[PDB]
Ligand binder design. Structure first.
Ligand code: NH4
Ligand code: NH4
Lengths: 274, 274
């Protein structure tokens, strides 16, 4: 394990950390986007009152790596969750999340009958190309099991026709959840081989999606509030910034508090990772 | 390996990072001390001119963990060097450094004839206690070899009499180098056993001490300047903040530069560790 620290706080005033002052928080440089804050308020000496320690994360959006709004590739939602990146499976709800497997703009060729492994048990197969070489029949699988299939027409006027979005139901009680996007550039119909050329892939590990429950507790951050696109997690009871010590906030986040006299206070937050 | 990022820089103006804005730099919370800065100056578009990229580290001082100025335990020198802590072996010179092995205020008892292993091949032995139980004969060793010895009187008026400082010569061309401090609280003369009680230990790995040479080069930071207590390391040639990329500065430090149009510039430094 290793440690990533934030800016140092001094004195007994209110304090605030975000991505710019705490390198542990998630941050996307291309879109210049982050989601997390940690605040300390209303200290009495070194004791934070109930509700004075607040971790907040609010959904934000970033450009697909394969950026092409006209073909249906504009932005997707992102959310920091205890210093890790997650994808909200419904872009308006902060409490249902999954890990991103792929966000890619690399070119791949799939030959009919062959599988492109996407990672974590997910794959796409070109099952067939049509005689005229303008349509490809794709199939999406998880651990060898059928999930979905679609016929994609690759040389129409409409650039969105090249994109396949897999929408699944009953994922953490959400329906119409986009779990995979695949953009097919073209099809190549050779003498012996036909191949599909892919460029643009986005996949979340929907099979491992989770829900943050109102009853969940994260160490001393044990008052979870879910308000649409924002999680706000707060302390139910007093929290002491014990001098000359480390104190868990929760779920891998900590404060380091300096060895000073009780007339002073100096501390910074940090995150522990592996 | 893992990554620790600093604050984001935007635009074509001059920029500066220190410990408060770059969590990769060394920082001591108890003494509130750091030593490192990284600056970017005089950009022409995304090209830093010769001398425009400067890494500086200046020796600072911290309290011994066993803090007791009267017994000779006040402060020792520290220096960040490419995000790692080093001890300058001469507190006025930034170019001769060693790693800290121990900075301790824990109590230990050593029985006569027994060895306290200090780490990294170093040990101290209580060889004998005197009949009156007011003096202990200590010996310092490295990989079993004799380095130094001293008779310490533990119940005099002078509190500095309890401290043994080992001073060695010919370490990276420095003489009178304090490599070990040992503070003996007291001696206990039992019926069968006599033991020495230690509290206060400080050790640097002097055997692996190194010198930063004027001719040394650290990737693209290849102009080393040594000025007493300060190392200033600079770029001899142009350095491009290539957009949508990572670029090595040197010795584990990098810039991450955002994918933007050439009308903009956004980047942050980071350090790679293992
Ligand atoms: N919800
Ligand atoms: N020097």
């Amino acid at each position: 394990t290793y440690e990533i620290r934030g800016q140092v706080a001094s004195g007994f005033g209110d304090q605030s950390w975000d991505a710019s002052s705490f390198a542990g928080f998630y941050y996307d440089i291309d879109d210049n986007v982050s989601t997390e804050t940690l605040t300390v308020s209303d200290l009495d000496g070194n004791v934070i009152p109930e509700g004075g320690l607040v971790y907040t994360t609010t959904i934000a959006d970033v450009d697909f790596e394969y950026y092409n709004p006209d073909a249906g590739w504009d932005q997707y939602p992102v959310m920091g969750f205890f210093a890790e990146e997650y994808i909200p499976i419904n872009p308006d709800k902060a409490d249902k999340i999954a890990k991103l497997v792929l966000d890619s703009d690399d070119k791949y060729t799939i030959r009919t009958g062959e599988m492109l492994d996407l990672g974590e048990g997910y794959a796409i197969e070109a099952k067939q190309v049509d005689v005229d070489g303008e349509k490809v029949w794709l199939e999406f699988t998880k651990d060898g099991e059928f999930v979905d299939d679609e016929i994609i027409s690759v040389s129409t006027a409409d650039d969105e026709a090249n994109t396949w979005d897999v929408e699944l139901d009953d994922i953490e009680d959400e329906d119409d959840v986009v779990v995979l996007k695949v953009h097919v550039n073209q099809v190549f119909q050779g003498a012996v081989d036909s191949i599909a050329q892919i460029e643009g892939l986005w996949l979340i590990d929907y099979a491992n999606a989770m829900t943050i429950e109102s009853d969940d507790e994260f160490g001393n951050l044990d008052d979870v509030s879910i308000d649409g696109d924002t999680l706000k997690i707060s302390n139910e009871d007093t929290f002491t910034l014990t001098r000359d010590s480390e104190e868990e906030i929760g779920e891998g986040m900590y404060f380091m508090i300096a060895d000073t006299s009780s007339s002073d206070l100096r501390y910074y937050p940090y995150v522990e990772k592996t």
